[PDB]
Design a protein around this motif. Structure first.
Motif, PDB file in Angstrom:
ATOM      1  N   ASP A 186       0.862  -1.175   0.000  1.00  0.00           N
ATOM      2  CA  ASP A 186       0.000   0.000   0.000  1.00  0.00           C
ATOM      3  C   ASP A 186       0.906   1.235   0.000  1.00  0.00           C
ATOM      4  OD1 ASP A 186      -2.076   1.793   0.145  1.00  0.00           O
ATOM      5  OD2 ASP A 186      -2.787   1.171   2.127  1.00  0.00           O
ATOM      6  N   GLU A 187       0.320   2.423  -0.102  1.00  0.00           N
ATOM      7  CA  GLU A 187       1.111   3.648  -0.096  1.00  0.00           C
ATOM      8  C   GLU A 187       1.763   3.904   1.251  1.00  0.00           C
ATOM      9  OE1 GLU A 187      -1.018   7.258  -0.760  1.00  0.00           O
ATOM     10  OE2 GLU A 187       0.829   8.436  -0.944  1.00  0.00           O
ATOM     11  N   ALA A 188       3.087   4.009   1.250  1.00  0.00           N
ATOM     12  CA  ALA A 188       3.824   4.211   2.488  1.00  0.00           C
ATOM     13  C   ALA A 188       3.722   5.663   2.950  1.00  0.00           C
ATOM     14  CB  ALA A 188       5.273   3.810   2.310  1.00  0.00           C
ATOM     15  N   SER A 189       3.357   5.855   4.212  1.00  0.00           N
ATOM     16  CA  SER A 189       3.245   7.196   4.770  1.00  0.00           C
ATOM     17  C   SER A 189       4.621   7.707   5.177  1.00  0.00           C
ATOM     18  CB  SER A 189       2.282   7.222   5.959  1.00  0.00           C
ATOM     19  OG  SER A 189       2.761   6.435   7.033  1.00  0.00           O
ATOM     20  N   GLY A 190       5.541   6.790   5.461  1.00  0.00           N
ATOM     21  CA  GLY A 190       6.893   7.207   5.790  1.00  0.00           C
ATOM     22  C   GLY A 190       7.714   6.123   6.453  1.00  0.00           C
ATOM     23  N   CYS A 191       8.898   6.477   6.934  1.00  0.00           N
ATOM     24  CA  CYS A 191       9.751   5.490   7.576  1.00  0.00           C
ATOM     25  C   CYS A 191       9.334   5.355   9.037  1.00  0.00           C
ATOM     26  CB  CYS A 191      11.228   5.876   7.454  1.00  0.00           C
ATOM     27  SG  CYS A 191      12.388   4.638   8.085  1.00  0.00           S
ATOM     28  N   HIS A 192       8.706   4.231   9.362  1.00  0.00           N
ATOM     29  CA  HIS A 192       8.186   4.003  10.699  1.00  0.00           C
ATOM     30  C   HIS A 192       8.893   2.829  11.363  1.00  0.00           C
ATOM     31  CE1 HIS A 192       5.037   6.838   9.699  1.00  0.00           C
ATOM     32  NE2 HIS A 192       4.706   6.111   8.648  1.00  0.00           N
ATOM     33  N   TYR A 193       9.328   3.033  12.606  1.00  0.00           N
ATOM     34  CA  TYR A 193       9.989   1.990  13.388  1.00  0.00           C
ATOM     35  C   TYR A 193      11.154   1.352  12.633  1.00  0.00           C
ATOM     36  CZ  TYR A 193       5.901   2.540  16.342  1.00  0.00           C
ATOM     37  OH  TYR A 193       4.910   3.052  17.147  1.00  0.00           O
ATOM     38  N   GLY A 194      11.787   2.139  11.768  1.00  0.00           N
ATOM     39  CA  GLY A 194      12.962   1.701  11.039  1.00  0.00           C
ATOM     40  C   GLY A 194      12.710   1.268   9.605  1.00  0.00           C
ATOM     41  N   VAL A 195      11.441   1.151   9.213  1.00  0.00           N
ATOM     42  CA  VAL A 195      11.108   0.625   7.886  1.00  0.00           C
ATOM     43  C   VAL A 195      10.045   1.459   7.168  1.00  0.00           C
ATOM     44  CG1 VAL A 195      10.126  -1.345   6.635  1.00  0.00           C
ATOM     45  CG2 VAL A 195      11.720  -1.742   8.525  1.00  0.00           C
ATOM     46  N   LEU A 196      10.236   1.683   5.871  1.00  0.00           N
ATOM     47  CA  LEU A 196       9.266   2.425   5.069  1.00  0.00           C
ATOM     48  C   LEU A 196       7.914   1.709   5.013  1.00  0.00           C
ATOM     49  CD1 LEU A 196       8.640   4.796   3.194  1.00  0.00           C
ATOM     50  CD2 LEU A 196       9.455   3.395   1.289  1.00  0.00           C
ATOM     51  N   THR A 197       6.916   2.267   5.695  1.00  0.00           N
ATOM     52  CA  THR A 197       5.591   1.658   5.774  1.00  0.00           C
ATOM     53  C   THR A 197       4.445   2.671   5.698  1.00  0.00           C
ATOM     54  OG1 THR A 197       5.550   1.740   8.213  1.00  0.00           O
ATOM     55  CG2 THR A 197       6.442  -0.253   7.204  1.00  0.00           C
TER      56      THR A 197
END
Ligand SMILES: [Zn+2]
Ligand SMILES: [Zn+2]
Ligand SMILES: [Zn+2]
Ligand SMILES: [Zn+2]
Lengths: 70, 73
Positions: free
Chosen positions: B10-21
């Motif tokens: 899906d469209e990633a909102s940003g780098c979260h908890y170390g990973v682009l998600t």
DNA sequence: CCAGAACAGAGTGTTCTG
DNA sequence: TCAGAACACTCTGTTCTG
């Protein structure tokens, strides 16, 4: 005494097949309603009391193969 | 140029908890690691995780999160 | 008993904020 | 920038009702 769909305790003979209540209402809702169920595995997902929520597609499949109808 | 979630595509909102998600996989990861869940795979621990089916197997979803390197610190 | 309705919860996803 | 809070929605399961 046992649901032929998920193996949970069967409430009775529903829609032609010995099932529990959850699979009863699930079957009706699945057949009449417009759902987008899609299997993430290989169409052999284990459907039991714990995992029956996981793959509605395979659950519906087991219902149909069991002969359930409206 | 648009960024993609490494967990469900899906469209990633940003780098979260170390990973682009995306947001859903973010909050899911948080809730999964901290929360007491009974996730159990109904397949072969290799379920396809995309936008439609990510709700299907939380076990494989969390597995992809961990293998992607997600952490809380 | 069985079908259907209705109420309630789990899990999930988005919006807002600093 | 990203992390977390909180509300709202979908799907489900039990209880209630005819
Ligand atoms: Zn059942
Ligand atoms: Zn399946
Ligand atoms: Zn995602
Ligand atoms: Zn799985």
């Amino acid at each position: 005494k046992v649901c032929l769909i998920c193996g949970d305790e069967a409430s009775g003979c529903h829609y032609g097949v010995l099932t529990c209540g959850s699979c009863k209402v699930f079957f009706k809702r699945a057949v009449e309603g417009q759902h987008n169920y899609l299997c993430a595995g290989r169409n052999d997902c284990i459907i039991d009391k714990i995992r029956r929520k996981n793959c509605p597609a395979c659950r519906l499949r087991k219902c149909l193969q069991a002969g359930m109808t409206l």
